[PDB]
Amino acid sequence: SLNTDDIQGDILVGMHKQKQLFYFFAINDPATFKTHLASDIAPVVASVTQLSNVATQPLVALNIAFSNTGLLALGVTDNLGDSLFANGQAKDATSFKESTSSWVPQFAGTGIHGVIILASDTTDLIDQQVASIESTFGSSISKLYSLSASIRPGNEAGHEMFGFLDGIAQPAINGFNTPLPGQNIVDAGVIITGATNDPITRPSWAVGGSFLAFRQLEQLVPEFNKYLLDNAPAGSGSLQARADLLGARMVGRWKSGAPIDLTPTADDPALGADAQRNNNFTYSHAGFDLGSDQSHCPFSAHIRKTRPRADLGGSLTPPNLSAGANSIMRSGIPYGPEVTSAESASNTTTQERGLAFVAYQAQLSQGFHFLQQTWADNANFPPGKTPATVGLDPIIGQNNGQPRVVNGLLPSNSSASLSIPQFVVSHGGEYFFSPPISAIGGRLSA
Ligand SMILES: *[C@@H]1O[C@H](CO)[C@@H](O[C@@H]2O[C@H](CO)[C@@H](O)[C@H](O)[C@H]2NC(C)=O)[C@H](O)[C@H]1NC(C)=O
Ligand SMILES: *[C@@H]1O[C@H](CO)[C@@H](O)[C@H](O)[C@H]1NC(C)=O
Ligand SMILES: *[C@@H]1O[C@H](CO)[C@@H](O)[C@H](O)[C@H]1NC(C)=O
Ligand SMILES: C[As](C)(=O)[O-]
Ligand SMILES: O=N[O-]
Number of other CB atoms surrounding residue 105 within 10 Å: 12
Query: What length is written for the chain?
Result: 446
Does the Cβ of 342 fall within 6 Å of ligand 3? Answer: no
Distance, CA of 418 to CA of 81 (rounded, Å): 40
- Resolution of this model in Å is 1.9
The residues facing 47 across adjacent strands are 8
Report the domain count for the chain: 1
Distance, CA of 106 to CA of 113 (rounded, Å): 11
The protein residue with its alpha carbon nearest to ligand 1, atom 19, reads 317
117 — phi, psi (to 5°)? -95, 115
State the closest ligand 5 atom to the C-alpha of 302, by its place in the atom list counted from 1.
1
Number of other CB atoms surrounding residue 237 within 10 Å: 15
Pick from 426, 419, 383: nearest CA to 404: 419
Centre of ligand 2 from the C-alpha of residue 333, in Å? 29
Does the Cβ of 332 fall within 6 Å of ligand 5? Answer: yes
Distance, CA of 445 to CA of 345 (rounded, Å): 53
Pick from 328, 309, 329: nearest CA to 367: 328
Pick from 410, 406, 411, 382: nearest CA to 393: 406
* Method of elucidation: X-ray
Centre of ligand 2 from the C-alpha of residue 228, in Å? 12
Does the Cβ of 416 fall within 6 Å of ligand 3? Answer: yes
In this structure, are residues 103 and 426 in contact, taking their beta carbons and an 8 Å threshold?
yes
Q: Please give the biggest Cα pair distance in the chain.
A: 69
Q: Which residues line ligand 1 (CB under 6 A)?
A: 181, 276-277, 280, 317-318
Amino acid (one-letter) located at 49:
T
Return all residues near 291 (Cβ < 8 A) that are at least 6 apart.
384, 385, 386
In this structure, are residues 146 and 178 in contact, taking their beta carbons and an 8 Å threshold?
no
Amino acid (one-letter) located at 54:
V
State the closest ligand 3 atom to the C-alpha of 415, by its place in the atom list counted from 1.
2
Q: Which ligand is nearest to the CA of 233?
A: 3
Number of other CB atoms surrounding residue 71 within 10 Å: 25
In this structure, are residues 425 and 93 in contact, taking their beta carbons and an 8 Å threshold?
no
In this structure, are residues 74 and 354 in contact, taking their beta carbons and an 8 Å threshold?
no
The protein residue with its alpha carbon nearest to ligand 5, atom 3, reads 332
Q: How many CA atoms lie within 13 A of 228 on its CB side?
A: 25
Q: Could you tell me the CA-to-CA distances from 383 to 14, 169, 281, 312, 371 in Å, in that order? A: 33, 23, 19, 8, 14
Distance, CA of 76 to CA of 145 (rounded, Å): 23
The boundaries of the domain holding residue 308 are: 1-446
In this structure, are residues 3 and 195 in contact, taking their beta carbons and an 8 Å threshold?
no
Amino acid (one-letter) located at 219:
Q
Three state DSSP letters for the chain? CCCCCCCEHHHHCCCCCCEEEEEEEEECCHHHHHHHHHHHHHHHECEHHHHCCHHHCCCCEEEEEECHHHHHHCCCCCCCCCHHHHHCHHHHHHHHCCCHHHCCHHHCCCCCCEEEEEEECCHHHHHHHHHHHHHHHHHHEEEEEEEEEECCCHHHCCECCCCCECCCCCCEECCCCCCCCCCCEECHHHCCECCCCCCCCCCHHHCCEEEEEEEEEEECHHHHHHHHHHHCCCCCCCHHHHHHHHHHHHHCECCCCCECCCCCCCCCHHHHCCCCCCCCCCCCCCCCCCCCCCCCCCCCCHHHHHCCHHHHCCCCCCCCCCCHHHCCEECCEEECCCCCHHHHHHCCCCCCCEEEEEEEECCCCCCHHHHHHHHHCCCCCCCCCCCCCCECCCCCCCCCCCCEEEECCCCCCCCCEEEECCCEEEEEEEEEEECCHHHHCCHHHC
The protein residue with its alpha carbon nearest to ligand 1, atom 18, reads 317
Return all residues near 201 (Cβ < 8 A) that are at least 6 apart.
81
In this structure, are residues 130 and 22 in contact, taking their beta carbons and an 8 Å threshold?
no
Distance, CA of 147 to CA of 335 (rounded, Å): 8
Instruction: Name the residue of 292, 389, 410, 415 whose CB sits within 8 Å of the most ligand 3 atoms, as the mutation to test its pocket.
Output: 415
Distance, CA of 359 to CA of 368 (rounded, Å): 7
Distance, CA of 239 to CA of 233 (rounded, Å): 9
Pick from 353, 356, 348, 326: nearest CA to 338: 353
Checking the chain for breaks where C and the next N are over 2.5 Å apart, the residues before them are none
Number of other CB atoms surrounding residue 347 within 10 Å: 16
Pick from 377, 360, 233: nearest CA to 302: 377
Does the Cβ of 393 fall within 6 Å of ligand 5? Answer: no
Instruction: Name the residue of 265, 280, 281, 285 whose CB sits within 8 Å of the most ligand 4 atoms, as the mutation to test its pocket.
Output: 285
Distance, CA of 378 to CA of 303 (rounded, Å): 14
Q: Could you tell me the CA-to-CA distances from 281 to 147, 180, 184, 188, 275 in Å, in that order? A: 36, 11, 11, 23, 12
Return all residues near 2 (Cβ < 8 A) that are at least 6 apart.
12, 48, 173, 175, 176, 188, 192, 195, 208
> Annotation-wise, does 302 bind a ligand?
yes
Amino acid (one-letter) located at 333:
I
In this structure, are residues 442 and 230 in contact, taking their beta carbons and an 8 Å threshold?
no
Pick from 146, 144, 111, 112: nearest CA to 129: 146
State the closest ligand 3 atom to the C-alpha of 417, by its place in the atom list counted from 1.
5
Centre of ligand 3 from the C-alpha of residue 414, in Å? 8
Does the Cβ of 360 fall within 6 Å of ligand 5? Answer: no
Distance, CA of 52 to CA of 47 (rounded, Å): 8
The residues facing 26 across adjacent strands are 142
State the closest ligand 1 atom to the C-alpha of 182, by its place in the atom list counted from 1.
1
State the closest ligand 3 atom to the C-alpha of 416, by its place in the atom list counted from 1.
2
Centre of ligand 1 from the C-alpha of residue 271, in Å? 14
Does the Cβ of 357 fall within 6 Å of ligand 5? Answer: yes
Centre of ligand 1 from the C-alpha of residue 181, in Å? 10
Burial of 21 (0-12, 13-18, 19+ CB in 10 A): buried
423-443 burial code (b ≥16 CB/10 A, e <16): bbbbbbbbbbbbbbbbbbbeb
Does the Cβ of 287 fall within 6 Å of ligand 4? Answer: no
Centre of ligand 4 from the C-alpha of residue 132, in Å? 56
> Could you list the active site residues?
166
Does the Cβ of 311 fall within 6 Å of ligand 5? Answer: no
State the closest ligand 4 atom to the C-alpha of 281, by its place in the atom list counted from 1.
1
